[PDB]
Design a protein around this nucleic acid. Sequence first.
DNA 1: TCTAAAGATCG
DNA 2: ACGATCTTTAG
Length: 245
Amino acid sequence: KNRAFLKWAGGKYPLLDDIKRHLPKGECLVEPFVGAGSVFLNTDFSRYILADINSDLISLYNIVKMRTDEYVQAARELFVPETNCAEVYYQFREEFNKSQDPFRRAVLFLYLNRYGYNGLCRYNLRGEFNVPFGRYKKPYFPEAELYHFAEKAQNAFFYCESYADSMARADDSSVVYCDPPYAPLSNSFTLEQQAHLAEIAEGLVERHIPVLISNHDTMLTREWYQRAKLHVVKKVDELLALYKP
DNA sequence: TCTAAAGATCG
DNA sequence: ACGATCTTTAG
Ligand SMILES: C[S@@+](CC[C@H](N)C(=O)[O-])C[C@H]1O[C@@H](n2cnc3c(N)ncnc32)[C@H](O)[C@@H]1O
């Protein structure tokens, strides 16, 4: 069981076993909401199509892939005891937001993810990262996870685009796994998008393309994924919607 | 999920 | 320039 090098919400590590158990077999795996890519790191497809709306995220993934050794050596320099304090953090955060170099931003991005408050990723309407200092004892530099990501990424393509466009890339030999932002328990992921995602899923399964969707087990998710074989996992339970052709 | 301060929106 | 009400910001 492999871990990602990034702290990221929606890490489905406790549910990885349940996901792989319902995930159909295929040649290519498509992930419209790849995030930390825990599913990508713990499956075994011959090729992957990985996408996310976060441009900083996708940019990092490309750099780690194409320029692995150069990146690891550069990013490791920021994981020294001297950098674990507020003043250094807020200057590095300011350097990230003012940098126009993809490589430097990707290097600082890992630092901010490991030293930032609760590993959050928050922006303002200007696209500026504004997560405060995290105050951890000693942040772990995920060197092993980085190299393992780069190796598996050799069979993956990273795109920065909405789910509708990424799911449009899926063909006959493709399996689509969707891990959308959690449905509410009653710039966010609106209810209309939640419903639209299920609609696109029904379109793919009508074209003989397998689609698996994970989400909370609420009334809305039941109504959204009504045309799928629902599976309940595990307060609020977890739901798996399988669209089998 | 929290909040004080600053900006946005309308008639 | 007013003022109530959100909206945004960032620790
Ligand atoms: C809940 S996270 C899941 C991450 C991933 N499953 C993991 O293991 O880390 C959902 C991700 O989808 C991305 N996302 C949000 N809205 C999107 C949209 N409208 N289209 C495509 N991706 C989106 C977000 O950037 C977020 O990282």
